[PDB]
Amino acid sequence: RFLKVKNWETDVVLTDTLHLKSTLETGCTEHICMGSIMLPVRTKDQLFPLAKEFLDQYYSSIKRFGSKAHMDRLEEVNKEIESTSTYQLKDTELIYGAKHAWRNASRCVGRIQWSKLQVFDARDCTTAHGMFNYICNHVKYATNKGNLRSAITIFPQRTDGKHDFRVWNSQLIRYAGYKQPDGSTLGDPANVQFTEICIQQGWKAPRGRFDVLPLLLQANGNDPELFQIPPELVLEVPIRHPKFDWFKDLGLKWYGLPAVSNMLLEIGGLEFSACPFSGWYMGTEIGVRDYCDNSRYNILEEVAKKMDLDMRKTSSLWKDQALVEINIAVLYSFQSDKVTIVDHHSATESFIKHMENEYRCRGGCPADWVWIVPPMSGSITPVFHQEMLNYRLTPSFEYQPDPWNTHVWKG
Amino acid sequence: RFLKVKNWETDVVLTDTLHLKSTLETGCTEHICMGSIMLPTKDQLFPLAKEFLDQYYSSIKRFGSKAHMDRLEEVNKEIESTSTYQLKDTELIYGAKHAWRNASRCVGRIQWSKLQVFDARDCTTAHGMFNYICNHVKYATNKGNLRSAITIFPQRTDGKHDFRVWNSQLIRYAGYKQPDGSTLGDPANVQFTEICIQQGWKAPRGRFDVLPLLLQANGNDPELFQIPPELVLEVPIRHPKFDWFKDLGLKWYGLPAVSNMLLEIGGLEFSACPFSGWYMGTEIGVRDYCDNSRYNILEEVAKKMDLDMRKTSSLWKDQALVEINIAVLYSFQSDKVTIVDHHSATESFIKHMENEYRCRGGCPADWVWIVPPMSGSITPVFHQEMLNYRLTPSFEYQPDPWNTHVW
Ligand code: HEM
Ligand code: HEM
Ligand SMILES: Fc1cccc([C@@H]2C[C@H]2CNCCc2ccnc(-n3ccnc3)n2)c1
Ligand SMILES: Fc1cccc([C@@H]2C[C@H]2CNCCc2ccnc(-n3ccnc3)n2)c1
Ligand SMILES: C[C@H](O)[C@H](O)[C@H]1CNc2nc(N)[nH]c(=O)c2N1
Ligand SMILES: C[C@H](O)[C@H](O)[C@H]1CNc2nc(N)[nH]c(=O)c2N1
Ligand SMILES: [Zn+2]
């Protein structure tokens, strides 16, 4: 079964055969579409077929399907599985797996870069302190003095699910959020719960509007531990506007390295519960979501006041106007400090090309429209006009419950 | 099976049960989501008619009543003998209001029950069709105090006698391809403007020529009719700060009136059912003015603003887009023609969602369409999870007539 998708700005049509290789479930049925829903221990029983299917893709990509290298590895994995209940990936397989999980991330607009991923193998790690060291090296390599590089560090896979490695932070770099007695919130409101935990676990909080959270790291199912990233490793950018000289006085800054650290990486049935990864920011992530969401830094008003905008009627589009300048400022600041960043027009255009290239060479490109489309200026970016099929390939990056909700405290 | 939807900006959770009455299909499966695809007999008819009449008689608290049971038999009887059946005016209005209610792609559904329904089922000719449309236009415009309306022509019979309005909207601007290879006026209408000339329209070949109506009655050949200008309210677009803006030569019409959809009620098919509300600002400002496949004026406006169009990263497209939309809302409000901004509209829809969960157990909605084409995440519907499914009575798309019409 072939499936066609159409771009309504260019009339270009594309055919998807790739969706046939999709195993996992979407959350939709023929009677309901859940495409706007954010969120719609494993036995030898089902592991080898997962292992086989993965190793089969692997060997096709290296053009060795059916070869002796292929069959012996299939056999080797099998024996390791019924003997030891699990198995270990070669380095070559891990790398491949990581690249492809990225490649299959239908919510990521930056996948054009997917082949250029630096994979760090932390599968020999045993302690939190070990984890800290690995992470710092990640933050340094990926940061590269502002010329950012894509990277992922991969810690040991899950075993019985009682010895998980986890990074409790949702991102490696992120600002504290303090709930005040008067109900207001100092810093980033998203991180309030996580800030509290840190404080409880012994973190001494400066209590400012931009405090870099400590890392809270869990190795082998043990209680997590705190570590303070060397400040000299944390690239930050002061935010200023190129025309408005009062903008700098808003006292805003942001960090350069966007690094997701709470997802689960699945390769051939293997589950890697600690797999922090990092690219570079698309402007709107900071400019629109981080700064302007009502549940985040919410600087819309305070910015709009200083702009002297008609704030009396929403039909003056003061909000829309302010949003744009803030985003302009974010891009300006980063380029001025030579820290890698991409604007939403640039990124979306690249993605369309990437996506086209992927139908040609791969027969499809899973993509979540709800997420691919930028959160401002939607229809003047080409992805808005782009039909997109969403499905789930493996390897994959999956969500996983917050570890404070599951962890068994040793004490 | 009993679903919950979460707003991620307010933590409000609504439970959806209404979806369990969904009848038609979405085109999605368990393996593939198509939520961003634009378009995914007597034995057939009676069950259809029953489902409708049941929910109708339930809505009027006479479910199971004799009137209910009687009507069920009465309609059953007619289907058996005529192969079709006809709707009572009460049923016709309820069906219409409810088709709008179920329109998961329409952000303005909070107004759903204040729909004026015009029964035009006694229409026989295109000339008659013109008269009804003109009356609809005039009523809904209301000198600029817009009122929602639908005018409903006779239902399909054998598919040979279909009524159709060929225009996609009652009021649209023509589009002409130049020898220049460029496109003057509205590119979305190039092919329709063609057929208009092909049927005999004398195009003034301007940028903003109001298209004529091309009406088809009882399956006959369609006929051209020009809407009396004095019934077509237009707004000259000026910016409330840029005086150079007026020289851009921009204007838009006030009445947004979809005319190409198919209205399904209790199995019956109304292939001609023009309906109209009032514009959300971005419909014109973002989509009509700035889509690349449309009037595409962004460059010209940016040039006029003297913005560094050298790099995408100056967000100059973004900057202009805002001003242009300010202008549109400005012009309409200055001429006292009803218009709603994307902020008020989406806020209204959030409220409507909460009422619908509370009074009906849910609200089908298509996120890809409800989120406005600008400033997505600063409207509240962005952080609102929505479930999409198709309820009936319904507005469905249907093929353009020039591909179907037996000439
Ligand atoms: C290199 C430049 C990159 C850019 C510009 C980029 C862009 C984005 C953006 C804007 C999002 C939306 C995040 C949100 O709205 O919450 C996203 C999501 C995502 N990206 Fe990236 N990305 C990049 C690199 C990467 C890398 C290196 C990986 C993994 C190896 C990756 C995997 C993902 C995944 C798995 C998601 C979905 C996360 C979720 O569901 O919460 N991306 N990407
Ligand atoms: C009264 C104020 C109204 C507002 C503010 C409004 C708003 C909108 C908007 C913004 C769209 C998106 C259109 C697009 O981007 O192409 C839409 C579509 C739609 N509206 Fe409304 N509308 C209104 C009245 C009505 C009425 C009176 C009806 C029916 C009786 C209706 C039914 C629909 C339907 C069926 C669609 C989907 C059409 C399609 O799929 O192309 N709306 N509406
Ligand atoms: F399922 C959810 C329930 C609540 C909140 C949520 C927030 C959206 C998820 C965050 N998504 C990742 C955001 C992010 C931050 C920093 N860097 C990236 N990033 C880096 C490379 N690619 C993306 N992404 C999900
Ligand atoms: F699937 C498609 C293929 C080609 C064009 C397409 C355009 C989106 C459909 C138009 N949607 C209606 C636009 C419109 C215009 C004027 N008024 C309204 N309107 C009025 C009240 N509610 C909506 N809607 C879809
Ligand atoms: C409810 C809704 O699906 C949710 O807010 C989504 C919408 N699209 C998004 N798109 C991106 N890139 N990131 C997000 O967090 C979201 N949020
Ligand atoms: C590809 C995508 O489905 C298509 O561009 C949709 C996106 N959302 C839309 N939303 C509205 N309101 N109107 C539209 O025409 C569209 N087009
Ligand atoms: Zn779906």
Interrupted after residues, chain A (C–N over 2.5 Å): 40
**What phi and psi values does residue A80 have, to the nearest 5 degrees?**
-65, -35
Domain B16-121+148-158+262-276+346-370 has CATH 3.90.340.10: yes
A33 touches chain B (CB under 8 A): yes
CATH superfamily of domain region B234-256+279-344? Nitric Oxide Synthase; Chain A, domain 3 (3.90.1230.10)
Strand (E) positions, B364-403? 394-396
Into which CATH architecture does domain A16-123+150-160+264-278+348-372 fall? Alpha-Beta Complex (3.90)
Query: Tokens 């207001």 map to which residue?
Result: A184
Ligand closest in space to the Cα of A102: 1
E strand residue ranges, B272-386: 275-276
DSSP-derived pairing of the beta strands A151-154 and A118-121: parallel
Instruction: Determine the Cα–Cα distance for residues B67 and B19; give it in Å rounded to an integer.
Output: 28
Structural domain boundaries in chain B: 16-121+148-158+262-276+346-370, 122-147+162-233+397-401, 234-256+279-344
A384 annotated to bind ligand: yes
Spatial CA neighbour of B332 closest among B230, B232, B236: B236
- DSSP secondary structure letters along B98-140: HHHHT-TT-TTGGGTT--EEEE-TT--SHHHHHHHHHHHHHHH
Interface of B with A in 312-351 (CB under 8 A): 312-315, 317-319, 321-322, 325-326, 329, 333, 341, 343-344
Q: Give one DSSP letter per residue of A360-408, joined into a string.
A: HHHS-----HHHHS-SSSGGGSTTTTB---B---SSEEE----GGGT--
- When CB atoms are compared, the residue of B32, B344, B385 closest to A19 is B32
**SS3 at position B316:** helix
* Chain B partners within 8 Å of A9 (Cβ): 291-293
Tokens (6 digits) for B190: 């190039």
Interface test mutation site (partner B, options A2, A23, A28, A33, max chain B beta carbons within 10 A): A33
- Altogether, the residues listed in chain A come to a count of 411
Residue whose CA is at the smallest distance from ligand 6 atom 12:
B369
Closest CA of chain A from B100, distance in Å: 19
Whether A160 and A41 have beta carbons less than 8 Å apart is answered as yes
Would you give the DSSP letter of residue A127? S
CB A167 within 8 A of CB A125: no
Query: Would you give the DSSP letter of residue A10?
Result: T
Cα(B36)–Cα(B55) distance, rounded to whole angstroms?
Answer: 30
Q: Under a CB-based contact definition with an 8 Å cutoff, are residues B274 and B216 in contact?
A: no
Q: Which residues of B291-315 are buried (b: 16+ CB within 10 A; e: fewer)?
A: beebbebbeebbebeeeeeeebbbb
Give every CB contact of residue B113 below 8 A, 6+ residues apart in sequence: B97, B101
Residue A123 CB partners (closer than 8 Å, separation 6+)? A88, A94, A154, A155, A156, A157
Please state, in angstroms and as integers, the Cα–Cα distance from residue A33 to each residue in A27, A289, B262, B388, B390, following that order.
Answer: 8, 25, 22, 5, 10
Question: Which has the closest alpha carbon to A345: B378, B91, B298, B372?
Answer: B298
B 295-314 → A contacts, CB under 8 A: 298, 312-314
Our answer to whether residue B8 is catalytic in this structure is no
How far apart CA A169 and CA A188 sit, in angstroms, is 14
Residue B175, φ and ψ in degrees, nearest 5: -135, 125
A331 to A289, A340, B63, B319, B323: CA distances (angstroms)? 14, 10, 61, 14, 20
Nearest atom of ligand 1 to the alpha carbon of A289:
15
Ligand 7 centroid to Cα of residue B107, in Å, is 19
Catalytic choice (B283, B323, B356, B363): B283
Helix (H), strand (E) at residue A195: helix A192-200
Amino acid in the structure at residue B204: P
Chain A environment of B382 (Cβ under 8 Å): 375
Does B242 reach chain A within 8 Å, measured CB to CB? no
> Could you tell me if residue A363 is left (phi over 0), alpha (psi between -120 and 50 degrees) or otherwise beta?
left
DSSP string, B189-241: GHHHHHHHHHHT------SSPBPPEEEE-TT---EEEPPPGGG--EEE---SS
Among B370, B371, B377, residue to substitute to test ligand 5 (most atoms within 8 Å of Cβ): B377
Q: Look up B106 and say whether it is catalytic.
A: yes
- Cα separation values, B183 from A22, B169, B176, B179, B205, Å: 43, 20, 6, 9, 11
Report the DSSP pairing between strands A215-218 and B257-258: unpaired
CA distance B404 to chain A (A): 22
CA B93 vs. chain centroid, Å, equals 17
- Contact (CB, 8 A) for A101 and A396: yes
Report the half-sphere exposure of A353 (CA within 13 A, side-chain side): 9
Residue B278 among the catalytic residues: yes
Q: At what angle do helices A44-61 and A68-84 cross, to 10 degrees?
A: 160
**Helix crossing, B316-334 with B298-305: angle to 10°?**
100
> Cβ neighbours of residue B198 under 8 Å, at least 6 residues apart?
none
In this structure, what token pair is assigned to residue B296?
């595409």
Contacts of residue A387 in chain B, CB cutoff 8 Å? 36-38
Q: Tell me, yes or no, if the two domains B16-121+148-158+262-276+346-370 and B122-147+162-233+397-401 fold the same way.
A: no
The residue from B112, B166, B278, B316 that is catalytic is: B278
Instruction: Please state whether A19 falls in left (phi above 0), alpha (psi between -120 and 50) or beta.
Output: alpha
Cβ of A30 and B35 within 8 Å? Answer: no
Instruction: Give B218→chain A minimum CA distance, Å.
Output: 33
Interchain CB contact of B249 with A (< 8 Å): no
* CB atoms B22 and A31 under 8 Å: yes
Angle B146-B151-B152 (CA atoms, 0-180°, nearest 5)? 160
Nearby residues of B8 by Cβ (< 8 Å), 6 or more positions away: A38, B383, B384, B385
- For a ligand 6 pocket test, name from B369, B370, B371, B382 the mutation site with the most ligand atoms within 8 angstroms of its C-beta: B369
Q: Compute the distance between CA of residue B361 and CA of residue A79 in angstroms, rounded to an integer.
A: 54
Catalytic residue among A225, A271, A285, A325: A285
B382–A36 C-beta distance less than 8 A? no
Nearest to B341 among A3, A314, A345 (CB): A314
Is B106 marked as binding a ligand? yes
Residue A171 pairs with which residues in a beta bridge?
A: A260
Which amino acid, one-letter code, is at A379?
S
Place of tokens 């009887």: B77
Q: Which residue of A has its CA nearest to B35?
A: A35
Architecture of the domain spanning B122-147+162-233+397-401: Alpha-Beta Complex (3.90)
Using the Cβ of B37 and the Cβ atoms of chain A, whether some distance falls under 8 Å is answered with: yes
Q: Could you tell me the CA-to-CA distances from B65 to B57, B60, B61, B71, B366 in Å, in that order? A: 8, 10, 9, 10, 36
CB-CB neighbours of B196 under 10 Å: 22
Query: How far apart are the C-alpha atoms of B132 and B130, rounded to whole Å?
Result: 5
C-alpha–C-alpha distance, residues A395 and A54, integer Å = 8
Q: Pairing relation of β-strands A236-238 and A225-227?
A: unpaired
**Is B28 noted as a catalytic residue in this protein?**
no
SS3 state of residue B5:
strand
Indicate the residue of A37, A343, A389 with minimum beta-carbon distance to B32: A389
Distances from the Cα of A312 to the Cα of A186, A309, B339, angstroms: 27, 9, 17
Tell me the chain A residues in contact with residue B343 when contact means C-beta distances shorter than 8 Å.
314-315, 317, 319
CATH topology for A236-258+281-346 is 3.90.1230
Rounded-to-integer distance, Cα B13 and Cα B6, Å: 5
CA B44 to chain centre: 28
- Phi, then psi, of B114 in degrees rounded to 5: -95, 60
Chain A residue with CA closest to B315: the answer is A328
Are the CB atoms for B68 and B58 separated by under 8 Å? Answer: no
Chain B residues closer than 8 Å to A19 by CB: 31-32
The angstrom resolution of this structure is 2.1
In degrees and rounded to multiples of 5, residue A124 shows phi and psi of -90, 0
Residues B53, B62: contact at Cβ < 8 Å? Answer: no
Tell me which ligand sits closest to the C-alpha of residue B338. Answer: 2
Q: Beta partners for B264?
A: B269, B394
Kindly list the distances between the CA atom of residue A20 and the CA atoms of A35, A104, A111, A370, in Å, as whole numbers in the listed order.
Answer: 19, 14, 21, 22
- Interchain contact, A315 vs B382, CB within 8 Å: no
Bridge partners for B394 per DSSP: B264
B interface test, pick of A17, A36, A368 with most B CB neighbours within 10 Å: A36
Half-sphere exposure of A404 (CA within 13 A, CB side): 13
- The structure tokens listed for A208 are 């400012």
Show Cβ contacts of residue B243 under 8 Å, excluding neighbours closer than 6 positions. Answer: none
Which residue in A has a C-alpha nearest to residue B280's C-alpha?
A315
| A59 belongs to an annotated ligand binding site | no
User: 3-class SS at B342?
Assistant: helix
Inter-residue contact B312 to B320 (CB < 8 Å): no
Helices (runs of H) and strands (runs of E) counted in chain A: 11, 16
Token couple for B264: 């399904």
Rounded to the nearest 10°, the torsion over CA B66, B67, B69, B73 is 130
CB of A280 shorter than 6 A to ligand 1: yes
Which two three-digit tokens encode residue B36? Answer: 């961003």
The domain A124-149+164-235+399-403 is placed in CATH, from the list 3.40.640.10, 3.60.70.12, 3.90.440.10, 3.40.50.300, at 3.90.440.10
Bridge-partner residues for B149, per DSSP?
B116, B276
What tokens appear for B86 in the block?
């006809």
Distance from C-alpha of A196 to C-alpha of A203, rounded to nearest angstrom: 9
Provide, for chain A, the percentages of residues in helix, strand and coil under a 3-state DSSP scheme, each rounded to the nearest 5.
Answer: 40, 15, 45
